[model samples]
Target: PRGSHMSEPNAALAGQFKIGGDLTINRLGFGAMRITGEGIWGQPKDVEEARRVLRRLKALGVNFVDTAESYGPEVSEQLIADELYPYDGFVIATKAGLQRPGPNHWVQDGRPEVLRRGLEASLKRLKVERIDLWQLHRIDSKVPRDEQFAAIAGFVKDGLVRHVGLSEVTVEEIEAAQKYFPVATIQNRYNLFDRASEEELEFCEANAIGFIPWAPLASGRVGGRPVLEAVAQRHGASPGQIALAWMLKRSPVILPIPGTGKVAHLEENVAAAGITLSEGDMAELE
Candidate 1:
């Protein structure tokens, strides 16, 4: 369930970054996971509402939508295509690697053939000639790492993917992948509380790679903390907004794709781009 709260959408925030050193997108983006069913499997609760969710991203000027082939086992990509195909100024980033066997169940299968098949189906479902930012959902440990990296490199070389990224990987892993193709972005589970990827974020910042933080708000629970709440009250913003603002201040390369199914929640996420935290606020959060 994304963005359960109801509120009015405000003026779009202004912050842009050139993804892959060329494709420009707003730093505050959208993650398309919540639009799917209860465990991210099967059809949406309301297909029309799901379409509205995609449309709202455009309406808010939020240009980056992160998704994956495993999401809904293809439902998320199809919904994006059904509603917002032929992307004009937006960036649709989708991933391959994970096979969805059941609700909340994910198994990694980054074999070259599995990656290739996923890429082909993703292209058709996304209705795109070239994917803006194609990411490997995860590095399958059971498979040879080079084989997985080479498969993605081949996609870029063949013009099927515009740029390549990796999720849940390390600095060394990124370097290894770079040997095959340019590393455009790194998607990892990063947030206010879970900074397990702090070193990875620093590396991305130093190397100019987009660091997309999944679960940016810690599933909207990070805002309930006293420090975040105090800062929110000071700025007349919500704790969620303050949390996102903190991530924006954390690093230039940190791109948070906080997802929600409600337009009101989407508006709140977009509005976070407007909140500028002070040095003291940053220190307190730290």
Candidate 2:
């Protein structure tokens, strides 16, 4: 499932970011979700630590980063601006749809106007003129899908966003949107234990669509301490690292943005880019 077509990058920091149907992105991207705090509702426990992690993400050759306006109700985007300012002009993917209509709850609002507002606010927060890749967070049954994406297309025409992506959609859903605008990336929950996204994942792979794994680590499935201990000992890595390596091996187009605040965790995560999995390990994980 994962690591099926991935190759080892030539250099230590040479992470892989592939072009998904002409969409340029590095294979090893950064997931900014973890920068938020408990429940992903507010500031992080260590804001400074989050900044340091962001810096490391860049210094370690990360060229793609994913965040959402719903993350901490603009927490992730604000932190990205605060910590990684001047916007070095890389591939930054942000999503819209789920909004904080309240303190700790998110309301599904994919209405065209709400989606437009989300993009404008995200642009303001990130201090960027145009977002590289913008994603429709989710499809709201209340709002016509055509209207939701037409709003995104409007932003694209106005130079607010360069490319459009989709999240948590099926093959038909993608085909439906391709008629309106180009689909650059597809983010869905996929991991070693769960192959629920297998068909969608394959569709993206065949179409050369960028595959961004929301929760790259399949921690829930491979939680037996003994199994993790055995694999960790063999690879000289943590269970999380093993999981990331598995994702990298699963597909060449996959860009697992495993986010973390700890520098030690950052080191481990980046190192995963270099950990190669054998055919048997890849087959076993699949």
Candidate 3:
């Protein structure tokens, strides 16, 4: 299972999830952050390998990709456009509101004008007239939440954004945002070990909004955690794969974007979609 062909472990195995009542995509998507350099700053060590990882997405049937403006301070978005412009059936979900100054530095700036500028810059870097799913990377406390929401709504009205979403938000924030525009999806830090956003996930499920879980593998902790090894052994799969498979089975609205820079790791992640766990396994994971 480790060396599965790139085109073999189809993401369709994870099933489909529709965002914003439309824009349906495969449940197991790729996260573009890892394609960036360490600390998510500057260019990756091997730019060609980064491009190769992106080019292989279609073969794996992973049409949905998540990236942010802060990622590489624009490096990730540019690489994506350079390698995969005119994305035929692929859905590119990018974010604004987070500012990057240097290695491992991220600042939140949700000011209306700042967001507007970010959107314009993202459109250029992505080489697209309209972003499929443009999300507010974070809710800046300095700015009124409603002002940020209104600015996002304006993007929808201006036809700059097809659908809008919010990241790292709570249920109340989602409700607040909906008053301005339809909340398409919520990108939050969630996984087997990190369930702090559990309530938000449930809210998205009830509202038919997509829940894209970042760090689906829990940063390599799942692979060695005692709680996951038993189930991993039972399925003849790596603990990381079981962790991802559990996310796929956790909820239909869940779209786990596991990120990796290596092509081999990408293929390994795609293989997780094919894993089917039993009720007992789910219970153990829970």
Candidate 4:
């Protein structure tokens, strides 16, 4: 038995979904982490190239973007604004709660004050009056869960954020956050090679919460697997594209935001949406 949905080799061909029952975005999205320096710390070597990559997203029909306040400690969001300001129908999802101590160094700081400051800075860096989707990058164990959750809930109440999300959270943690606000999305490390978040993915699917998969291509390692290679061959696609296509078919709620610093790579990643994996393909991937 097999089933498939095909599109015209476009990012929106993956499909469109309404987040929080209000904001609509293409099922395929972009992750804006690599636009920063090598370690995701400073400005990218070629700032103009980074801007060009972002500008290219629009032409590809991709409208969803994920970023973090700590990326470049400020570089990613600033570049996003520089290139895509007046975000026409783009669902720019960004996160707070993680502080960049240095290049490649991240520390969680969900204290109310830290989150408050991070939120304000993110708003300005992104040049947005209200963040469409504001996420808690990581819930610090040092802080009381209620303290951080309540603070984020206030962001929505005060009109600072339209939706709330969590990253690297367990289903238990998702439930915990839900006590304060509806968790519209959950950003987690998920890919064809790694099923560590299988349960989380299932949870989001059942609840209709968008599941944004970070590192969806597994850092360009998805091609190493034999199954992905076979699927790629059958579809005449790259291994990374097949990997992303698998994620798209894995669940309707799954939003794979594959990241890249180059325009060609961005184009390839966006093209993943055009693929339609069949039931037999899923059988092989699983």
Model 4, CA-based lDDT:
0.88
Candidate 1 residue spans exceeding 4 A from truth: 1-14
Model 3: per-residue Cα lDDT over 85-159, one tens digit each: 988989999998988878988899999999999999999988899999999999999999889988888999999
TM-score on alpha carbons, each prediction = 0.94, 0.90, 0.96, 0.96
Per-residue lDDT for 33-131 in model 1, tens only? 988898999888887777887888876778899999999989999988988878887789999999988999999999999999999999999878888
C-alpha local distance difference test of each model: 0.86, 0.77, 0.89, 0.88
TM-score of 3: 0.96
Number of colliding residue pairs in model 3: 0
Steric clash pairs (candidate 2): 2-249, 2-250, 3-249, 3-250, 3-251, 4-249, 4-250, 16-27, 17-26, 17-27
Which of candidates 1 and 3 reaches a greater lDDT? Answer: 3
lDDT of 3 at 175: 92
Alpha-carbon deviation at 214 in model 2, angstroms: 0.6
- Give candidates' CA RMSD values in order: 2.9, 4.1, 1.5, 3.0
lDDT of candidate model 3 versus the reference: 0.89
User: lDDT tens string, model 2, 32-57?
Assistant: 88888877778889998888887776
Output the number of the lDDT-best candidate: 3
Model 2: weakest 10-residue lDDT segment is 1-10
